[PDB]
Structures are given as C-alpha cells and as structure tokens.
Ligand binder design. Structure first.
Ligand SMILES: CCCCCCCCCCCCCCCC(=O)O
Length: 133
C-alpha cells in the first residue's frame, strides 16, 4: 500500500509558508523563529505494519509510530496533544491531527523522487520539500 519509496532519510530543502502555518497553530514568535530556521531530517521507517516517522532537528525531535487507519495520540513538536490518524490516499500519506475543536492535515507525497509535505490548516497551506539522502 505505502510505497516503500517513502522509507528512508529525508532532508528538508525547501519550506514555504511555514511561518503562517505555525502562526495559525498559535505557535509563539520565538518558537516560530527557530521553527523557520530548522531544516529537519525526517526518517520514515516501517516494522511490519507499524510506520515510524522521526523528525530530527537541533531545535526539536519528534517521533510518531502508527498503523495506517488507527487513531493514535500524538504530542506534536509545539506540544499539542492531538488525536491523529494517518491513512493513504492516492499514494499520499495523509496525517490528520485533531485537538479541541481544530484540525490540521499534513499530506506527504512523492513527487519526482522528492517528498513533499503540505501542511494545511483552513486557508493556510505550507509546502515543504525534502530530498532523500
Ligand atoms: C519540525 C521541527 C521544527 C519545530 C517547529 C516547532 C513548531 C512547529 C509546529 C509543528 C509543525 C510540524 C509540521 C511538519 C510538516 C513536515 O514534516 O515538514
């Protein structure tokens, strides 16, 4: 189901509109500044049917592990506690995070060998491109 082409180590090379996304999330200024400077490495691995996404940066490291279609609790890098679910749709790995009464999505898709993460919260859309390394 999940392309084994997602598996590996990915390095952020381009980020667009991420400041606005973080602002939408209520991330404060000092954290936004560091957040915008970060160029995370994302490591995607699979163990059976459990996918792990590890995000590594000087500022913050996060790690989520899940099975597709199974709701899980996540503590995000900005310390939201969300109820999250990851599914595949059309080859894209779609992550929905819900908390209080909000929702944000992170879609990860492979585009010509690169991984493109689109982060969306209502009208705010970020695009983050990663290179496989
Ligand atoms: C991601 C490391 C930087 C940390 C910035 C801290 C607050 C950011 C809010 C969390 C959003 C994470 C969005 C991830 C999208 C992606 O994988 O590229």
């Amino acid at each position: 189901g999940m392309s084994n082409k997602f598996l590996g180590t990915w390095k952020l090379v381009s980020s667009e509109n991420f400041d606005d996304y973080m602002k939408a999330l209520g991330v404060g200024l000092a954290t936004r500044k560091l957040g915008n400077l970060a160029k995370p490495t994302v490591i995607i691995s699979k163990k059976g049917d459990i996918i792990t996404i590890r995000t590594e940066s000087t500022f913050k490291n996060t790690e989520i592990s899940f099975k597709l279609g199974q709701e899980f609790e996540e503590t995000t890098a900005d310390n939201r506690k969300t109820k999250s679910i990851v599914t595949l749709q059309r080859g894209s790995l779609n992550q929905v995070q819900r908390w209080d009464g909000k929702e944000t999505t992170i879609k990860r898709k492979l585009v010509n060998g690169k991984m493109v993460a689109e982060c969306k919260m209502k009208g705010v859309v970020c695009t983050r491109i990663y290179e496989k390394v």
